[PDB]
Design an enzyme around this catalytic site. Sequence first.
Site, PDB file in Angstrom:
ATOM      1  N   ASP A 331       8.443   5.658 -10.185  1.00 36.97           N
ATOM      2  CA  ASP A 331       7.945   6.893 -10.776  1.00 36.97           C
ATOM      3  C   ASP A 331       6.475   6.747 -11.186  1.00 36.97           C
ATOM      4  O   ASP A 331       6.073   5.730 -11.762  1.00 36.97           O
ATOM      5  CB  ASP A 331       8.810   7.269 -11.983  1.00 36.97           C
ATOM      6  CG  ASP A 331       8.323   8.525 -12.702  1.00 36.97           C
ATOM      7  OD1 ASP A 331       8.453   9.644 -12.150  1.00 36.97           O
ATOM      8  OD2 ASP A 331       7.825   8.384 -13.841  1.00 36.97           O
ATOM      9  N   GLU A 368       6.583   7.240  -5.784  1.00 42.07           N
ATOM     10  CA  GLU A 368       6.349   8.672  -5.904  1.00 42.07           C
ATOM     11  C   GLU A 368       4.859   8.949  -5.695  1.00 42.07           C
ATOM     12  O   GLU A 368       4.035   8.607  -6.549  1.00 42.07           O
ATOM     13  CB  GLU A 368       6.809   9.159  -7.278  1.00 42.07           C
ATOM     14  CG  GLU A 368       6.461  10.628  -7.581  1.00 42.07           C
ATOM     15  CD  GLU A 368       6.644  11.016  -9.050  1.00 42.07           C
ATOM     16  OE1 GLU A 368       6.705  10.122  -9.927  1.00 42.07           O
ATOM     17  OE2 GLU A 368       6.720  12.227  -9.332  1.00 42.07           O
TER      18      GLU A 368
END
Lengths: 600, 600
Positions: A331, A368
């Site tokens: 993330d 990501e």
Amino acid sequence: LKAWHLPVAPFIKEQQERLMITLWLSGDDLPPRVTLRAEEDNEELSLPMHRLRQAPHPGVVAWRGEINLVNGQPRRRYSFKLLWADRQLWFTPQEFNRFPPARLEQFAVDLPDSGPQWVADQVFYQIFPDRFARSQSRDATYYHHAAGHDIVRKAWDEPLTAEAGGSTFYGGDLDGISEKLPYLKQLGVTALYLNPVFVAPSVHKYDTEDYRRVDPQFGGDAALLRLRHNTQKEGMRLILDGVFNHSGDSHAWFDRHQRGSGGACHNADSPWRDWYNFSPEGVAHDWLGYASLPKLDYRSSTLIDEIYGGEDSVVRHWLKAPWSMDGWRLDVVHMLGEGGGARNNLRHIAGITQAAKLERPDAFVFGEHFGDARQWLQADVEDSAMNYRGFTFPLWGFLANTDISYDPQKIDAQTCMAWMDNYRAGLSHQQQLRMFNQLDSHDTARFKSLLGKDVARLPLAVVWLFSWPGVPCIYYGDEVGVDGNNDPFCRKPFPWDPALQDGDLLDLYKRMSKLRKAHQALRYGGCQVIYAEDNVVVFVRVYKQQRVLVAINRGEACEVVIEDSPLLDVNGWQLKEGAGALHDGVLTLPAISASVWFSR
Amino acid sequence: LKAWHLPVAPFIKEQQERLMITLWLSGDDLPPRVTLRAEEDNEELSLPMHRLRQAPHPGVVAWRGEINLVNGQPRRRYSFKLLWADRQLWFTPQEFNRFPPARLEQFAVDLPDSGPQWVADQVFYQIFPDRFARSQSRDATYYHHAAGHDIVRKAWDEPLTAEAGGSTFYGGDLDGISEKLPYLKQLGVTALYLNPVFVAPSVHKYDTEDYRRVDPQFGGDAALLRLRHNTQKEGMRLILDGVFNHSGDSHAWFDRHQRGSGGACHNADSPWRDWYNFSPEGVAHDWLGYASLPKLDYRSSTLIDEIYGGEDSVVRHWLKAPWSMDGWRLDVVHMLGEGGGARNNLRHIAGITQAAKLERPDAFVFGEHFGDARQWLQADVEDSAMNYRGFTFPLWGFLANTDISYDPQKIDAQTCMAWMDNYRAGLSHQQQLRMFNQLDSHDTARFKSLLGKDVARLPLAVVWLFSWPGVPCIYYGDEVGVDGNNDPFCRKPFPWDPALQDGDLLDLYKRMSKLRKAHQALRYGGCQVIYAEDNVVVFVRVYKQQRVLVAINRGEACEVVIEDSPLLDVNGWQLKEGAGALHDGVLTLPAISASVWFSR
């Protein structure tokens, strides 16, 4: 003048400690000399190419050269330098160039390939755990300090609303996923990517409170052990969401709400005070102005040890027994770094990936990347990225007239393919095959809604997702026709009532995953765009003698001529999906259709 | 539709903790909205732009936005997103793009700028020490073990021959350079780059034997101290050639010729055994098959300490008192690394640059890059590169019809400028200004010879060298017309007899360095290519209200129309060099000419 080359058989062949490279040419004024420009330890090399006596196809001249594989780094970059008496021409991933291509935009092959070779064989499915399924056994409310109130619980059929979206729990859990494994296996899934599951007060749980324990709301540690067992039993891979750019404000290391006495937020002598950055005014650096998400300062060598440096750091903890996860989705991978910003980011992502492979050599690590991920991928700091820039947004533009900002977008087939092929050109063939492609996710509007009036185009996106190079990822509910606007509305509960399911869309997903499982070129093959104009895109996947032809028409019905291509010189074609028709170099394409052919 | 923007005043203005950005547009169908796409800690940002009430120039509409400078990394990347009701268009360093530009090919400004800000003010001169000048005081022969014989000494007027080129000494030295400082100061030089000067048996001395002592043949330590004194006294900078990818085979660490007993070449227990890589067969890894140049293994932490890690490592040693050099040219920068190849290269070059700036914050560190240096420069592992790919070879192609391989080359003004502007687009404005530009060097044929029959074009190259963004470097003797083929023949003794000097060429160099010293835009300014077709290139350097217009015609005399450009909207023009003439948007250009205009 024409050229053809793809970084795969039949164009390349490893033979002993040599990599043989073959280039195809055709035309009236062929170059009497061709130089294979290759690289060894970043030094440019001019390698001779010799003309092959046998024409590989009618009117096609073949040249061959050799890269010596005993020296150099595993990634083999190369391009072709056509030489006449007075001039030169370069052949590249992006066709001909009159001036030399960028080093980082050559053909490239990874030999020896140490990446996760299993990824290319997968069909991924992404699950936002609270919204997927409740276990048969199966709601306790508590106070969300970062919000201004207790958490909210709603029944499965209660409509989603924009209120307290980060604190509304419908109660899906991990045993629920275990129970729905037969459905996913019928769908074609071989691998799961889960959104965060560690202890955290919010429903999405990127506000990590404890990196070492599964949140009880999702069923705790026992339930994740069961999911790992069940997935292993069904031969399915399992990827967890790794949130290391920031912690949650309720983490003990920070402890905004004074659940202990040695937290960094309220104690200058905290054991973890230097794990966070505080401005001259003392304001903690955070993720884009969200104070519940204080950013971690990777200047601190103890933080480095806790996250990825140590033997039992967080990254390795979940990759070894008894957890034995298959890797990490990273993330906000691009902002992680030192001093309250992205300083030293590439180095720290490299450390995280390295640590993972130490624990599991075949671990899959991908980031990501809403933006342009090429610099991360070109330095090999991660295996792959969520391919928003290379796959998602070109399709949003070409099919849905929109983009990352939901700004209007008007691009034709030319621009779409120029866009998609320019981005891949910065990637080795092995990297292209493991790019994490999806149509939407928990952080975007549902693609089906983005189509608006043009929703009839959705099947085209589905065929494309399973045939463009990369590993495809279904976002839960996409396959039965869930729609919705962006977060919070893209996270609806999955509709298990078949009456609320688009079963024709579901079957499409089943068939495309079968086509992919069936045909090597859809998993391993090169990719050549063959026709890109106004509404039509045609490309072929290529692997040894096999071909897979894909034709997408976003508009009204039409006919399109396909010039003789040596990549299409086959015994015949077998239509596998769609109503398109190929006969004598003419492709008859119904309105709003996508078609797939296998070569016989 | 037209757009203009350069990463310099008047388009950008730092005001408090904000960076203001202005975009110029002109046309019949202007976008009602424009988004400034910017970056903060690698996160893409959509920043509003507002329309300015005052037209900066006739028929030109101005938009302005702001980048907040208190957060983020110093390098500020940005682009412009033109938005209509149904579509978007991007404006970039490479004009308009229908799909989003690469992150690494945006406009970029370094704020705060921590690079060596003095570099942009320099005129560099490169000296191959043995061939430049003998001191008034002033020949001892010895045995070159790597060669098969003793070294050879020749008198200054003896013709160069291909025999024993690495062992023929004409005897130039460092006090010779000290004595010729008045000549260099009359030429315009403010900085010297020296080829290797440390103890080594060859004449070029990349076969380093001792990194801590100046070779006696060049005058030893005393002579280099004198050169540092004299250069300091004349306000001149001084850069040494740093050779850290490999050592010489006669270095004590390796000692092929058993001058000691603990060398790595012949002792498995050598203190430096793990500073070199030996194959399964025991063959030492070297530089491209030259056994006199064994490659250093930066896997070893003691080697790292000796070269750049330690307080008195080699890199820092020559940057502190009493040597106080101004930086390092990094030989074979792209191959340095671990395990006998370029493994971990970016990390080690970063370490070398970091160590240098620790000793001298304003130290200038740039790499020898015959190839595409963008990945090194885009990761900020070095300040700059020898700009062969961005400057040298485009001019070889456009003016001399040849390239790095002396392969034939036929490119027009379009391709040349597309090439030059594509390469810069990957560089921040501050990086572009310090690129190390030259027409030739000790590792190429002399540009004058490469021109062959077209030698009349040489003055065009000289004007271009002093006006294209970057710091210009004269290769010794270029300015008086030395010619020659590649190594060994590009290293002739400098002709100090004025009868053997092209004094008209020398004057040209003097005037261009005066123009550069005079005009801020030639040192600090942005650069916009204005006309590029067949034989003609026209570009303007831009800085605040000042402009510098440069027009190059490689062929027969012609006239060229220049459409009204708001960058050319000035009070008038003053011709400073050449015979070109500008009147009412028409440029009259004599055959084989280059012209420079200052704005009044």
